[PDB]
Design a protein around this ligand. Structure first.
Ligand SMILES: [Ca+2]
Length: 75
DNA sequence: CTGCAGGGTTTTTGTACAGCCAGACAGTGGAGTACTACCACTGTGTAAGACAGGCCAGATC
């Protein structure tokens, strides 16, 4: 199998070269994609002409540091 | 024992010089900021009307 081959043959090379792996996890996008699941439910327009547009808007809004910083609010 | 009344007794309560400043009253000219109903759009539930086919009556096999 593939990943097995990667991990028994190719781990050391990349770990040597590009600093760190798992650092570049795809985990983030897929894992977070459940946000695209929920946003469609709650804040839809709704009409697919807009459904994207407003979903993307809310998403990026939820994504910037700035509002996350203001969400922490002194721990 | 009881009820009632002069005063006690301490607390509470308002009236009392005396000066100070927060807080409000008018309005001005309209911005403007908050509010309230369109509004474009389809997803979801709904229930009137097709309808068919199953059944009884008419009449038959
Ligand atoms: Ca995936």
């Amino acid at each position: 199998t593939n990943y097995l081959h990667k991990t028994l043959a190719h781990v050391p090379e990349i770990v040597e070269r590009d600093g760190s792996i798992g650092a570049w996890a795809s985990e983030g996008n897929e894992s977070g994609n459940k946000l695209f699941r929920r946003f469609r439910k709650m804040n839809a327009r709704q009409s697919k002409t807009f459904e994207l547009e407003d979903i993307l808007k809310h998403h990026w809004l939820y994504t910037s540091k700035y509002l996350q910083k203001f969400m922490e609010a002194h721990k």
